[PDB]
Design an enzyme around this catalytic site. Structure first.
Site, PDB file in Angstrom:
ATOM      1  N   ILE A  39       0.872  -1.164   0.000  1.00 26.66           N
ATOM      2  CA  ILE A  39       0.000   0.000   0.000  1.00 26.66           C
ATOM      3  C   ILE A  39       0.912   1.218   0.000  1.00 26.66           C
ATOM      4  CG2 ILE A  39      -1.738   1.274   1.255  1.00 26.66           C
ATOM      5  CD1 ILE A  39      -2.775  -1.351   2.310  1.00 26.66           C
ATOM      6  N   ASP A  40       0.899   1.975  -1.090  1.00 25.95           N
ATOM      7  CA  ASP A  40       1.850   3.059  -1.255  1.00 25.95           C
ATOM      8  C   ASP A  40       1.517   4.218  -0.324  1.00 25.95           C
ATOM      9  OD1 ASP A  40      -0.462   3.554  -2.496  1.00 25.95           O
ATOM     10  OD2 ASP A  40       0.393   4.346  -4.354  1.00 25.95           O
ATOM     11  N   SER A  41       2.295   5.293  -0.448  1.00 19.08           N
ATOM     12  CA  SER A  41       2.143   6.435   0.441  1.00 19.08           C
ATOM     13  C   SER A  41       0.856   7.204   0.191  1.00 19.08           C
ATOM     14  CB  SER A  41       3.347   7.368   0.295  1.00 19.08           C
ATOM     15  OG  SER A  41       3.506   7.810  -1.041  1.00 19.08           O
TER      16      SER A  41
ATOM     17  N   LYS E 228      -6.924   7.633  -5.812  1.00 21.43           N
ATOM     18  CA  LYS E 228      -5.733   8.231  -5.212  1.00 21.43           C
ATOM     19  C   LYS E 228      -5.626   9.712  -5.547  1.00 21.43           C
ATOM     20  CE  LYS E 228      -2.236   5.663  -6.283  1.00 21.43           C
ATOM     21  NZ  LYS E 228      -0.900   5.061  -6.066  1.00 21.43           N
TER      22      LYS E 228
END
Ligand code: CDL
Ligand code: PEV
Ligand code: PEV
Ligand code: PEV
Ligand code: PN7
Lengths: 83, 34, 245, 33, 304
Positions: A39-41, E228
């Site tokens: 899970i990226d930043s 995102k």
């Protein structure tokens, strides 16, 4: 305010499922978002935003960087709720 | 009455906007040629 | 019957430039002051030609642009107000529409006039604002309708979900149409290339900057004031952590 | 039943709708230049 | 005999050109037919000869962009049939209402109506299929996904299309016939595009969805990337708004340098006959000898 670790993980796993797709059976306290769950930043920011919206747990931006494992997030939320 | 004009504030705002726009348009339609 | 005399006038440079069109009023004024104080005073002075035609067309073009702009902006405000029962969302969308139109046309002016040297035809502005307003309505309405139907779970989570759901569709539609319009650059007619690439660069800028970052970030800054006449919550009542599974 | 009337009718009568639009396009493009 | 802008004028220009090139000049002499009426003729006759290349290149681009959006040939084919049927219905309906003298057309309203019809049709088709596939990727079956698609996008399509129709009917109040003639044909075209998008679109989706895995989603990680982006927007909205406004300022600061031009012979190929007549004349007199003004002073008494 005594949400047990299992309750906090049950609440976190729904958000991690929605944001990424990792099965709640895979979100365990010893896995780290960076390598194990991958899970990226920027998905951590989304998990934090959705946790704050749902359960009112506000995790500021500078502390979100030091929460590596799911155990770190659970411990942070518990230390915050024991207020 | 204020209690009833705030259930119909959307059609009133629409009327005032359409009226101002229509007056401005019929005013600008006259400039050309003249 | 000798009652009317006519003069045939030629210009020096380009008759249909900005100066050859500003010379028309000067020709009329010169011919009018020439008969002042003479027995021909009060005669009617008619000036036809092709630079006179374009003087009158250039005058009417401004007012027709204003008429169309007022009409379209009022219709857009009205539909954004009917859909989202809020004045701030409608006003924000009309403002971002005007700003994106300005920025789009400024970018095309830059590219065409200041870089390629070719000035923009006089109908490019009109045909560009028509199509750009038409499609900006589509995309803004689709984004804000989804936003409204999803802010029930918190304005921030509502924006995240609305982006993930409708922002991708809005950008797909915008990019398909923008790259369709930028294929006019293969026309021999420079006016077609101008209008096509103006619409295309405008849509690229809109879908990739304005509608993708500037509209939802304004919706996120104005937390509950984005929906002002409606009273919405920034986030729901905090729920207790669920029981396992 | 619990489905709205407009989409339910569009879904039930989907193929006559497609056939009608095809016939309309055919007529409109053959009767007129 | 015509009137600049109409078709009788082009009839007259070609008639005169026929008369002029019917016979042979002495050796060395070459005759031309210049002027802002022969230039308009050649312009309008090369416009269509470029438009028929544009009609091919834009479709060759639409197909590849649809393949890039939907990484699937069947979905691109379905949605292209939606777009093409909408465009055909629009062109047919407007040519019908103009043919029977019900409404007033133009050779410019048509070139704009085709563009706007393609824009609206592709937008509505992509909206519908995108909502259907999004509801399909959340686990809903074909029925529930169809109904979610409709309940989410039908009112948006209706509202946006009806406002495009109203806004482009409000062009009927301008003065220039260029714009004024765009009013009713563009409004009618938008109404037809919207009726098609709302009945034929969902009908095609509801027929093709019940076979195999025709309209099923392929690329859904795009939803993750856009979530995102939305997270970055809701976490730091101030900085992002500042960045977007800074980018828009670059374009907004060029506008007070905008100059326009009315010479149609600058925006046309120099290979047109009328432009070569212009060149032959410019070799000998000046640029402005073929575009003369006429000033008439009409008094009330014999001036001879
Ligand atoms: C005549 C000849 C013909 C010519 C024409 C015909 C040509 C035919 C072919 C055309 C070829 C072009 C094809 C177009 C793309 C087609 C694909 C499509 O339709 O959608 C699918 C596509 C998904 O593809 P995918 O591979 O399947 O996705 C899966 C990912 O791999 C999985 O995700 P991931 O892990 O890889 O990454 C996560 C996520 C990314 O997630 C993130 O981490 C991003 C968030 C970071 C934090 C937030 C920071 C933002 C800071 C904001 C500051 C202000 C805004 C500035 C933004 C710029 C920086 C981002 O990635 C995404 O998938 C979502 C991307 C969303 C962000 C993109 C927003 C665009 C930014 C603006 C860039 C361009 C500036 C516009 C100016 C143009 C005006 C002139 O959807 C998109 O992502 C759209 C964005 C990319 C396309 C647009 C980019 C440019 C396209 C052309 C524009 C040209 C500009 C030239 C400018 C030059 C200077 C003057
Ligand atoms: C391009 C054209 C642009 C022209 C229009 C520009 C924008 C004009 C803005 C004018 C604002 C007038 C609208 C007033 C809204 C009043 C709200 C109201 O009456 O009801 C709400 C009551 O909430 C309040 O307490 C509002 C009371 C304050 C109203 C005072 C008016 C403020 C005027 C603002 C001035 C801005 C003018 C800008 C002009 C350029 C809640 O009612 P509801 O939830 O039942 O209705 C929703 C369902 N349909
Ligand atoms: C020349 C004509 C143009 C002049 C008119 C100019 C101004 C036009 C303005 C048109 C306004 C139309 C309003 C439609 C948008 C309504 C906005 C709205 O309030 O949305 C509600 C929508 O509520 C509805 O249910 C409305 C459903 C409308 C269905 C669309 C009709 C489809 C008809 C199919 C055939 C179309 C034929 C049209 C021919 C032109 C929200 O409800 P919801 O959140 O629960 O989600 C909907 C789930 N069902
Ligand atoms: C008047 C024109 C103004 C233009 C304004 C444009 C502003 C747009 C902003 C574009 C943002 C691009 C994406 C930013 C992603 C942020 C990711 C991040 O924060 O971390 C990375 C940040 O990396 C970046 O991408 C930074 C952003 C670079 C783009 C900045 C250029 C846009 C601003 C242009 C200024 C005006 C130019 C002058 C006119 C041409 C990691 O950096 P680092 O710590 O590893 O680097 C250390 C190495 N020494
Ligand atoms: C969100 C993160 C943590 C993303 O880092 P990851 O890719 O390792 C970023 O580094 C950060 O803190 N601040 C950046 C602020 C920002 O993105 N502003 C919008 C740009 S103008």
């Amino acid at each position: 305010m005594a949400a047990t670790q299992e309750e906090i993980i049950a609440g976190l796993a729904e958000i991690i499922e929605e944001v990424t797709g990792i099965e709640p059976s895979e979100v365990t306290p010893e896995k780290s978002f960076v390598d194990d769950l991958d899970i990226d930043s920027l998905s951590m920011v989304e998990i934090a935003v959705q946790t704050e919206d749902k359960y009112g747990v506000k995790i500021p931006d500078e502390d979100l960087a030091g929460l590596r494992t799911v155990g770190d997030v659970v411990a942070y939320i518990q230390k915050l709720e024991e207020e | 009455m204020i209690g009833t004009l705030k259930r119909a504030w959307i059609p009133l705002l629409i009327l005032v906007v359409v009226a101002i726009a229509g007056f401005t348009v019929q005013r600008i339609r006259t400039f050309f040629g003249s | 019957d000798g009652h009317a005399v006519r003069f045939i006038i030629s210009h020096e440079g380009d008759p249909m430039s900005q100066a050859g069109i500003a010379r028309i009023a000067k020709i009329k004024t010169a011919a009018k002051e020439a008969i002042k104080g003479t027995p021909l005073e009060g005669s009617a002075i008619y000036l036809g030609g092709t630079a006179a035609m374009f003087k009158d067309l250039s005058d009417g073009n401004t007012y027709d642009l204003m008429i169309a702009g007022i009409s379209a902006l009022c219709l857009i405000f009205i539909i954004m107000l009917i859909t989202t029962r809020s004045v701030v969302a409608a006003a924000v969308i009309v403002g971002t529409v005007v700003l994106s139109l300005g920025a789009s046309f400024g970018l095309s002016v830059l590219i065409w006039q200041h870089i390629l040297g070719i000035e923009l035809h006089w109908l490019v502005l009109a045909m560009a604002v028509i199509i750009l307003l038409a499609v900006g309505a589509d995309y803004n309405l689709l984004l804000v309708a989804r936003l409204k139907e999803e802010i029930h779970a918190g304005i921030n989570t509502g924006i995240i979900r609305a982006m993930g759901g409708s922002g991708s569709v809005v950008t797909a539609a915008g990019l398909v149409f923008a790259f369709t319009m930028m294929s006019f650059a293969v026309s021999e007619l420079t006016v077609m290339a101008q209008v096509g690439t103006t619409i295309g660069m405008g849509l690229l800028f809109d879908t990739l900057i304005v509608r993708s970052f500037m509209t939802p970030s304004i919706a996120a800054l104005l937390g509950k004031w984005f929906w002002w006449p409606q009273v919405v919550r920034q986030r729901p009542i905090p729920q207790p952590w669920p029981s396992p599974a | 039943a619990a489905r709205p009337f407009i989409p339910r009718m569009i879904r039930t009568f989907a193929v006559p709708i497609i056939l009608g639009w095809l016939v309309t396009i055919a007529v409109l493009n053959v009767t007129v230049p | 005999a015509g009137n600049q802008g109409e078709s009788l004028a082009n009839e007259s220009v070609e008639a005169v050109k026929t008369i002029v090139e019917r016979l042979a000049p002495p050796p060395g002499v070459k005759v031309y037919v210049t002027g802002s009426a022969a230039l308009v003729a050649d312009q309008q006759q090369a416009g269509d000869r470029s438009l028929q290349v544009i009609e091919a290149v834009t479709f060759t681009v639409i197909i590849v962009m649809l393949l890039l959006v939907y990484r699937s040939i069947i979905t691109s084919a379905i949605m292209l049939t939606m777009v093409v049927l909408g465009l055909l219905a629009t062109r047919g309906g407007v040519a019908f209402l103009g043919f029977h003298r019900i409404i007033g057309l133009s050779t410019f309203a048509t070139n704009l109506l085709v563009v706007l019809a393609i824009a609206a049709a592709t937008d509505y088709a992509i909206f519908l299929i995108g909502r259907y596939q999004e509801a399909r990727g959340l686990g809903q079956d074909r029925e529930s996904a169809y109904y979610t698609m409709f309940g989410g996008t039908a009112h948006v399509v209706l509202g946006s299309g009806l406002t495009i129709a109203g806004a482009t009917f409000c062009l009927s109040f301008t003065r220039l016939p260029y714009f004024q003639t765009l009013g009713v044909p563009l409004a009618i075209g938008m109404v037809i595009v919207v009726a098609a998008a709302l009945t034929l679109g969902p009908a095609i989706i509801a027929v093709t969805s019940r076979f195999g895995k025709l309209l099923e989603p392929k690329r859904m990680a795009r939803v993750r990337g856009w979530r995102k982006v939305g997270a970055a927007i809701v976490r730091w909205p101030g900085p992002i708004l500042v960045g977007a406004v800074a980018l828009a300022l670059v374009g907004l600061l060029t506008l007070p340098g905008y100059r326009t031009n009315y010479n149609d012979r600058n925006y046309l190929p120099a290979d047109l006959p009328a432009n070569e007549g212009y060149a032959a004349a410019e070799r000998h007199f000046s640029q402005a000898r073929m575009n003369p003004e006429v000033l008439m002073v009409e008094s009330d008494h014999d001036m001879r």
